[PDB]
Structure formats: structure tokens, C-alpha cells
Design a protein around this ligand. Structure first.
Ligand code: HEM
Ligand SMILES: COc1cccc(-c2ccc(C(=O)O)cc2)c1
Ligand SMILES: [Cl-]
Length: 393
């Protein structure tokens, strides 16, 4: 019944150009079996959306990587939010939702916008820059560690730690093995900063610890929830912003539409999240036998969801392979969907909006002017180097 495919979605050849294989995965059927890793796969929009919104059968507490926590030891203590199901998920989720709330965005907006404006003006004085190191990495590094309340010492471990986190959701390939091996110094840095004395009052970390007073989380839960923000809160935005700049560099007509109406910045960023899908894949584990796409999946099976594929499925999207900054993007799964839908989405969108606003108001053209290099990661899609020349407006 179910088609068996040999495609390795975690191979460098797949990362280098995933789109033909993603069509093969969609068109093979609503559910496939990936023989390379002994997992089920769903790559169409409808089934990806259905699985994400069925948490009692497609659970997260057995891990959202390939590893099944019922079978193998997690490489670090489980996340209290990402790797938890309701009801254990609910109060930790509520704390992060409140720490990263609409009201909280008012406190950081002016600084985040000012830093984006200043960065674009700085890059315009240089002309020829790397949109990854000098923009997609530099801007989040300039605002997010500070908004967390992190000390200065040790921040060089943040991106390596996140690279490890996202590689570790993958299969035990070379990317994962290399990431986990000798990772203790990155772990030790992050785990130390999660302790309350190391977090500046008023920042996201200290605010998490302040919620221990309410009964929503205990004091021993707070460091792990700070850890969640230090795991997911930086490298995602690096690849999201890099994706947006790469889109604007490749689609000059859309950069010009954004210039003409900078209030399209928020949706231009959202469209970049759909179009590139910085988070490409993750897993669920079945808690029971379940029919999906006409396949009977047994209990305790891993199911791989192709978020980027769902976001390009022509069954759902018109002209899926076009970047369109006025597209109605609502419903894309680049931030997930359902009970685990990105709790940091307001921070991600704030960063993306204010950077694209600064570009819209200050830049007339973005021209690739050196070799583009891809950055390989088992979960994240993005570039290692994006040399561009910025022409001022
Ligand atoms: C463009 C940037 C980002 C993208 C594309 C993204 C994507 C995602 C996705 C797809 C999920 C769902 C995972 C699942 O269902 O298993 C998720 C969850 C999560 N994200 Fe985001 N993320 C981004 C930025 C951020 C930021 C800035 C933060 C924190 C400041 C953050 C923190 C989290 C956390 C803690 C979760 C777990 C939520 C839960 O399990 O309830 N992410 N993200
Ligand atoms: C499994 O695919 C994703 C996609 C986006 C964010 C994350 C993520 C990683 C770690 C945490 C955490 O440590 O809680 C939370 C979210 C995972
Ligand atoms: Cl850790």
C-alpha cells in the first residue's frame, strides 16, 4: 500500500537542492515510508497540518527528532515544552507565552528597531558585505542575547550550541555525531547561564525565573525553560532573516514592492518563512495505531513531517515557488501549528519586520556579488555565506 522511498532527507545532496525530492515525496502519496531511516514521512500540506494538530496520537514527549526517548537516552535532559505533551506542556508553555507576550514586545521594540536601522546604515557604508556573518548573524547577536539578559562572557558558545541542538534532531549521521561529540563545553556554558544569578533583571531569563513565584513553574523548572530560549531563540532568526535577504536578493521586483510600501515588511518576512522554511523538518511519535493517508501506522513509530514541502505544496498554494510579499500567508506551517506552534513567533516576527523595514527604507538594490555557500544542518535550512553589494536608496 505505502510507497517505499530511498531518499535520504538528511543527506548533503538533499540539502543542496531539496525541491525535486520534496515533489517526489508529495507525489508518491499522502504517506511514504523512508527506508533509509525506518520512518514514515508526510510531505503534503493537508497531512502535515493534520499531524501537527493531532497531539494525542502524534506526540512530542518521545522526542521530536529521530531518536525515540522510550528507546534511547536523550542527549540532554528533555525540554519541558518542546518535548512534552499536554498536560505537562501547558504551564511551561503559558510561562513562555507570557514572557514573550504582546505586552513584552512593547518593551523591546524601540531597541530592536533602532539596532536594525543602525546595522543597515553601517552595512551601507561598507557596500560589500556578507549577508550572513554581517547581517543575519550580526543583527540577532546584537539584540537577542541582551534581551535574554545574558552576560557578555561566553556568548561565542550560543550559535555552536544551537547548531548542535538542531543537528541532534536528525538521524545519527555525520552532522549529528560531530555535533554531539565534544559538545560538553557548549552545554556547560548554556546550562550555567540558565541559573538565576547569571540573568540580568528585566530580561527574558530573569522573567522566566520570576514566574516561579506564581505556581506555574517550580524553581527547578526555570533553568530548563531559559534553556529553551537559548536553544531556539537565536539560530532560527539567523536563518529566517538570512532567508528573507536571500529572497530579496533573488527577486528584485519584490524588493522594489517592499521599498514602495515598507508596511509590507512583516508580511515579506512571513512569506520568506513560508518560501524558504528555515525549519525544514521534525518528527512526532505515534502513541497508538493510527490510519494516516490510507496507511495503518503502528504504535511507537516515528513520523517525519516536511514543513518546507507543505509550504510549497501546489495542492494548497498558488505559484508556491514564487516569493510574493503580498501573499496571504496565513496557514503556512513554518512556525508549526497547534499546541506547539512557535511560542517565540512574536520575537521572530519583530526581528524580521524591523530588519526588512530598515532595508525597505534605506536600500535600493541587493546584488549577490560573490560565491554563495550553503550551511548544512539536519533541521535548519540556510546559508553559510551570502556576499552582496548594497546600493543605498
Ligand atoms: C524565524 C524564526 C523561527 C522559526 C521558523 C521557528 C519555528 C518553530 C517551529 C516550527 C516550532 C514547532 C516545533 C514543534 O512543533 O515540535 C517552534 C517551536 C518553538 N520555538 Fe520557534 N521558531 C523561530 C523563532 C523562535 C524564537 C525567536 C524563539 C524564542 C525567543 C523560539 C522558541 C520556540 C520554542 C520555545 C518552541 C517550543 C514551543 C512548544 O513546544 O510549545 N522560536 N518554532
Ligand atoms: C524540532 O524542530 C524545531 C523547530 C523550531 C524550534 C525548535 C526548538 C528547539 C529546542 C527547544 C527547547 O529547547 O525547548 C524548543 C524549540 C525545534
Ligand atoms: Cl544543555
Amino acid at each position: 500500500t505505502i510507497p517505499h522511498l530511498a531518499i535520504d532527507p538528511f543527506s548533503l545532496d538533499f540539502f543542496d537542492d531539496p525541491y525535486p525530492d520534496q515533489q517526489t515525496l508529495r507525489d508518491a502519496g499522502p504517506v511514504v515510508y523512508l527506508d533509509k531511516w525506518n520512518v514514515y514521512g508526510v510531505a503534503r500540506y493537508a497531512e502535515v497540518h493534520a499531524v501537527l494538530n493531532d497531539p494525542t496520537t502524534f506526540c512530542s514527549s518521545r522526542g521530536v527528532g529521530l531518536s525515540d526517548f522510550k528507546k534511547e537516552k536523550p542527549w540532554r535532559p528533555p525540554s519541558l515544552i518542546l518535548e512534552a505533551d499536554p498536560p505537562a506542556h501547558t504551564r511551561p508553555r503559558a510561562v513562555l507565552s507570557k514572557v514573550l507576550s504582546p505586552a513584552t514586545m512593547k518593551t523591546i521594540r524601540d531597541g530592536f528597531a533602532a539596532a536594525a536601522d543602525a546595522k543597515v546604515d553601517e552595512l551601507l557604508q561598507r557596500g560589500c558585505i556578507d549577508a550572513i556573518a554581517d547581517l543575519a548573524e550580526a543583527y540577532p547577536l546584537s539584540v537577542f542575547p541582551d534581551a535574554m539578559g545574558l552576560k557578555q562572557e561566553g556568548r561565542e558558545h550560543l550559535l555552536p550550541y544551537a547548531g548542535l541542538v538542531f543537528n541532534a534532531f536528525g538521524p545519527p549521521n555525520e552532522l549529528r555525531q560531530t555535533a554531539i561529540e565534544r559538545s560538553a563545553p557548549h552545554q556547560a556554558y548554556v546550562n550555567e547561564q540558565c541559573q538565576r544569578p547569571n540573568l540580568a533583571p528585566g530580561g527574558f531569563g530573569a522573567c522566566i525565573h520570576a514566574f516561579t513565584d506564581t505556581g506555574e513553574i517550580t524553581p527547578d523548572e526555570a533553568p530548563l525553560l531559559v534553556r529553551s530560549l537559548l536553544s531556539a531563540g537565536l539560530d532560527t532568526t539567523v536563518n529566517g532573516i538570512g532567508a528573507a535577504v536571500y529572497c530579496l536578493a533573488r527577486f528584485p521586483g519584490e524588493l522594489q514592492r517592499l521599498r514602495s510600501d515598507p508596511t509590507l515588511a512583516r508580511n515579506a518576512f512571513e512569506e520568506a518563512v513560508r518560501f524558504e522554511s528555515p525549519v525544514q523538518t521534525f518528527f512526532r511519535t505515534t502513541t497508538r495505531e493510527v490510519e494516516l493517508g490510507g496507511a495503518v501506522i503502528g504504535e511507537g513509530e516515528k513520523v517525519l513531517m516536511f514543513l518546507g514541502s507543505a509550504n510549497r505544496d501546489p495542492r494548497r498554494w498558488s505559484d508556491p515557488d514564487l516569493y510574493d510579499i503580498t501573499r496571504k500567508t496565513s496557514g503556512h506551517v513554518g512556525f508549526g501549528s497547534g499546541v506547539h506552534m512557535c511560542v517565540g513567533q512574536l520575537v521572530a516576527r519583530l526581528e524580521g519586520e524591523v530588519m526588512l523595514s530598515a532595508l525597505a527604507r534605506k536600500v535600493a538594490a541587493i546584488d549577490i556579488d560573490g560565491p554563495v555557500k550553503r550551511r548544512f544542518n539536519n533541521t535548519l535550512r540556510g546559508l553559510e555565506s551570502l556576499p552582496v553589494k548594497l546600493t543605498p536608496a
